[PDB]
């Protein structure tokens, strides 16, 4: 019954709307605004590099809502990890999101 | 978000197998019995060798990449197996369920 | 003696894509067998003119001439002249009609709350402001089906008070109150030369507009770190 | 709302419909004193598409976008020879709609 007005998946806002069918009275209807932001509370500054301070601000302008906080479940985020095993250093691509993407 | 609640009957001798969808990318596929009192979800069957303490040795996992149905089977029914069994994927269990369905005892 | 010539208008090139110069000569003496011609600036002739009207009720003859040219023959700045002759003045009377920037946005204002309380008719208004030059078009579509001018009207194009750069026009639609229990979204489509596709369809229904109740439901979790 | 996010101007429209005969007059008052004729524009009456013998008009007042932002009434006054006192007026504010009750549901669990 609710039209999916916004289904943002990178800041996770899920704004929507509907018209509430009131009684058979004059049209003093109500329009709904079910905004539903979910706070990660444990992610980093860049979403793709776990070395920055964690997260203080959470800015949500709903006009730029149609850098991110959360991780897209169908997207893959990776990085270069500098391992060595002795003298050589094979900088190899790691996975910051094991299971959203496979090699 | 599929909700195919089926009325498959069960008994001690009786065996009921649930059907679930698979992404087939070898992620963590699980069946989980939701607890009404706890308000969370407790994995009864997982991709790993974990099995619930109550369900030890009486459950079987059956995966077909060919037909795109992920199905689990229960050997014996004690008649207490009535709850929201939801399937799913991802590491997470609660917030990752794909489809839910409640099985039933007797009929 | 009355002679005029009109260029094509934007209400025909978008509706039919049949751009054509017209020449209307009437209120002359009642004498047939007249010649009408259209001449360009280069020396290219035109196609034949037909569909002449009958004599006027006040005892005078009319005459219409058509110059069917290509689409780019009017947007490339070619002057056209209408040759019309008469039995009394031996010189061929001729008339010259010539040439015509900002792109301005549509805005659809929903009917006010006071008008809806009368339960008679809500009027939707479509404002096309900041557009230059004139002759900007407008059409209403209900559920993607074209809306005729029987049920809608447009302000003949106009001018702005502080800036003389672009001019404004307006359009208002009429309906019932039972219609605004289902909506049908009453899209307002426009057609102006300063547009990519000559279309800037906008629509507003009861679902959009000013809402009367917001419930933000922001949740905070320590494990919802990948917004599934 | 779409027009106010451009942060340039605000456009208030006084819609005068359902009068008869023609020759209706419109002015734009603000805190008692009128506005200059170069601030508002009035269109000529045109017949109603459904109603046989009635008309309509319009009166656009364009102001700076910031000026709308702080209260500021802009009441439109209409004079027609069929009104009970020959003068009527309407007004809007930034605050002229409804209650718009927020219903916040902050969650920390
Ligand atoms: C940290 O953020 C920057 C800014 O976008 C970006 O390069 C990346 O996500 C992080 N930096 C590195 C070196 O990974
Ligand atoms: C928002 O309000 C609507 C009706 O006003 C209600 O159905 C909905 O559950 C509310 N949202 C939340 C998150 O409670
Ligand atoms: C919003 O209001 C509705 C009714 O006005 C209420 O049912 C709902 O619970 C509210 N949303 C909350 C408290 O999140």
Overall domain count for chain A: 1
Resolution number, Å: 3.4
Cα-Cα-Cα-Cα dihedral of C83, C89, C91, C94, to 10°? -30
Boundaries of domain holding A74: 1-103
In a domain, residue D6? The reply is yes
In a domain, residue C158? The reply is yes
Return the H-helix or E-strand segment holding D33. strand D33-34
Task: State how far the Cα of C204 lies from the Cα of C137, in Å rounded to an integer.
Answer: 19
Please, what's the b/e burial string for C110-125 (b: 16 or more CB within 10 A of its CB; e: otherwise)?
A: bbbeebbeeeebbbbb
Strand B97-102 versus strand B84-88 pairing type = antiparallel
In a domain, residue D102? The reply is no
Of residues A99, A58, A98, the one with CA closest to residue A79 = A98
Overall domain count for chain D: 1
* CA-closest residue to ligand 1 atom 2: A46
C143 and C63 part of one domain: no
Overall domain count for chain B: 1
* DSSP-derived secondary structure letter, C170: E
In a domain, residue D63? The reply is yes
In a domain, residue B90? The reply is yes
C36 and C115 part of one domain: no
Instruction: Output the domain CATH number for residue D5.
Output: 2.60.40.10
In a domain, residue B5? The reply is no
C55 and C118 part of one domain: no
Checking C178-182 for CB contacts under 8 A at 24+ apart, the result is: C179/C122, C180/A27, C180/C111, C180/C116, C180/C122, C180/C206, C181/A27
Determine contact: B52 vs chain A, CB below 8 A. Answer: no
Instruction: Output the domain CATH number for residue B25.
Output: 2.60.40.10
Which C residues 199-228 touch A at CB under 8 Å? Answer: 206-228
Q: In this structure, what token pair is assigned to residue B80?
A: 């207490």
In a domain, residue B82? The reply is yes
> Hey, are the CB atoms on A73 and B25 less than 8 Å from each other?
no
Q: Which of C80, C97, C114 is the last residue of a domain?
A: C97
Q: In this structure, what token pair is assigned to residue D40?
A: 């508002």
In a domain, residue C213? The reply is no
* DSSP-derived secondary structure letter, C214: E
> Hey, are the CB atoms on C218 and D48 less than 8 Å from each other?
no
In a domain, residue D103? The reply is no
C21 three-state secondary structure: strand
DSSP track, C116-163: HTTSS--EEEEEEEEE-SS--EEEEEETTEEE-TTSEEEPPP---SS-
> Hey, are the CB atoms on C219 and A41 less than 8 Å from each other?
no
The answer, yes or no, to whether any atom of ligand 2 lies below 6 A from the CB of A34, is yes
* Strand partners of residue C24: C4, C64
Q: In this structure, what token pair is assigned to residue D63?
A: 């102001």
Boundaries of domain holding B37: 16-103
Size of interface C-D (CB pairs under 8 A): 81
In a domain, residue C194? The reply is yes
For chain C, what is the radius of gyration of the CA atoms? 25
Boundaries of domain holding C37: 2-97
Task: State how far the Cα of C1 lies from the Cα of A33, in Å rounded to an integer.
Answer: 67
Residue D23 to residues C65, C183, D26, D56, Cα–Cα distance (Å)? 39, 34, 10, 10
C14 and C89 part of one domain: yes
Task: State how far the Cα of A30 lies from the Cα of C118, in Å rounded to an integer.
Answer: 19
Residues of C whose CB is below 8 A from D105: 215-218
A17 and A2 Cβ atoms separated by less than 8 Å: yes
In a domain, residue C113? The reply is yes
* End-to-end CA separation in angstroms for chain D: 35
> Hey, are the CB atoms on C226 and A70 less than 8 Å from each other?
yes
């Amino acid at each position: 019954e609710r039209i999916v007005l916004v289904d943002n998946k990178c800041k996770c806002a899920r704004i929507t709307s509907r018209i509430i069918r009131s009684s058979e009275d004059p049209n003093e209807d109500i329009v709904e605004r079910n905004i539903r932001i979910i706070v990660p509370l444990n992610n980093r500054e860049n979403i793709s590099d776990p070395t920055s301070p964690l997260r203080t601000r959470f800015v949500y302008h709903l006009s730029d809502l149609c850098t991110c906080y959360t991780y897209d479940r169908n997207k893959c985020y990776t990085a270069v990890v500098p391992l060595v095993y002795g003298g050589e250093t094979k900088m190899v691509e790691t996975a910051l999101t094991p299971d959203a993407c496979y090699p | 978000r599929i909700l195919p609640e089926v009325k498959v009957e069960g008994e001690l001798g009786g065996s009921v197998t649930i059907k679930c969808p698979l992404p087939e990318m070898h992620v963590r596929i699980y069946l989980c019995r939701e607890m009404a009192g706890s308000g969370t979800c407790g994995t009864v069957v997982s991709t790993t060798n974990f099995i619930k303490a109550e369900y030890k040795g009486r459950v079987t996992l059956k995966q077909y990449p060919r037909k795109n149905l992920f199905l689990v089977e229960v050997t014996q029914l004690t008649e207490s197996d009535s709850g929201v069994y939801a399937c799913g994927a991802g590491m997470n269990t609660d917030r990752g369920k794909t489809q839910k369905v409640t099985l039933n005892v007797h009929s | 003696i009355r002679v005029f010539a009109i260029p094509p208008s934007f209400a025909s090139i978008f509706l039919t894509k049949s751009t054509k110069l017209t020449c209307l000569v009437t209120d002359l003496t009642t004498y047939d067998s007249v010649t009408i011609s259209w001449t360009r600036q280069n020396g290219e002739a035109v196609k034949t003119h037909t569909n002449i009207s009958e004599s006027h009720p006040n005892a005078t003859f009319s005459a219409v001439g058509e110059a069917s040219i290509c689409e780019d023959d009017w947007n490339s700045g070619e002057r056209f002249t209408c040759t019309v002759t008469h039995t009394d003045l031996p010189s061929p009377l001729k008339q010259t009609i010539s040439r015509p920037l900002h792109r301005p946005d549509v805005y659809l204002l929903p009917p006010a709350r006071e008008q809806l309380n009368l339960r008679e008719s809500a009027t939707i208004t479509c404002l096309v402001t900041g557009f230059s030059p004139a002759d900007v078009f407008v059409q209403w579509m209900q559920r993607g089906q074209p809306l005729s001018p029987e049920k809608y009207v447009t302000s003949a194009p106009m001018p702005e008070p502080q800036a003389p750069g672009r001019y404004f026009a307006h359009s208002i639609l009429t309906v019932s109150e039972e219609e605004w229990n289902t909506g049908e979204t009453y899209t307002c489509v426009v057609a102006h030369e300063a547009l990519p596709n000559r279309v800037t369809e906008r629509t507003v229904d009861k679902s959009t507009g000013k809402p009367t109740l917001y419930n933000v439901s922001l949740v905070m979790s320590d494990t919802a770190g990948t917004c599934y």
